[PDB]
Structure formats: structure tokens, C-alpha cells
Design a protein around this ligand. Sequence first.
Ligand code: NI
Ligand code: NI
Lengths: 128, 5
Amino acid sequence: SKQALKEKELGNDAYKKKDFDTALKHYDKAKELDPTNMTYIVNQAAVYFEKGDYNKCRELCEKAIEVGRENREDYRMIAYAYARIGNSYFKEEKYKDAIHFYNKSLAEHRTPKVLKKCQQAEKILKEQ
Amino acid sequence: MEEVF
Ligand code: NI
Ligand code: NI
């Protein structure tokens, strides 16, 4: 399971080139070798986010959150997942929805990044 | 892009 790490990193590197189906496939190899690890699933959510499939992205976030809780993952990661859902809504200019999910994120593990992003969502909401 | 971990 230095194997799973290697699959994950090939996945990440591909994702970063916008080589999305390749990333997905390696994330899948990763999950197979190591299915208690939510990380692969949230990364997949990143992929769909960038492909611009916001619905599928939220679904994988939700799945990643389930997996993480079930397997007692870092709260931080659960928070990232929630914040990613928030981001998908932000992309869609559904700011009440974005903010709600940032709040969920913040309730799991408060991070400045998410706070700031939430507050800019608040501003957009407020100023029209 | 969204961060991957
Ligand atoms: Ni080696
Ligand atoms: Ni709710």
C-alpha cells in the first residue's frame, strides 16, 4: 500500500494536467487497494468539480464524508469535503447553499480558508 | 483548481 499511495499520486498529477479520466481510473485503483480511505473519493470529487459536473461532485463529497466518518478519518478532510460542496454551489451562484455547506465544513473543523471563502459568499449575497 | 490530497 505504498502501491495505493503511488496510484493516488499518479491520479493527482493527472488531475493537475486536466487529464481527468486518467486521474479517475488511478483513484479507482487506489480505492481498490485501500477502500477505507476517503481521500481517493474526495479527490475524485475534485475531478468532477473541474469537469464542471457539480452534481456528481457533491455526490462524491457526500460519499467521501460517509466513508471518512465510518472509518474515523481526520475531521479536517470531512471539512474539506463539505467546503467543496460549498464551492460547487458558489460556482453556481447559489450562495445561501454555499454558505450553509461552509458552515457544515466549519462545524467539523474550522479552517481560515473556508471561513474567508464563506465570508466572500456572504458579501456577494449581501451586495445584490 | 480544487486541491487534491
Ligand atoms: Ni522504489
Ligand atoms: Ni443542511
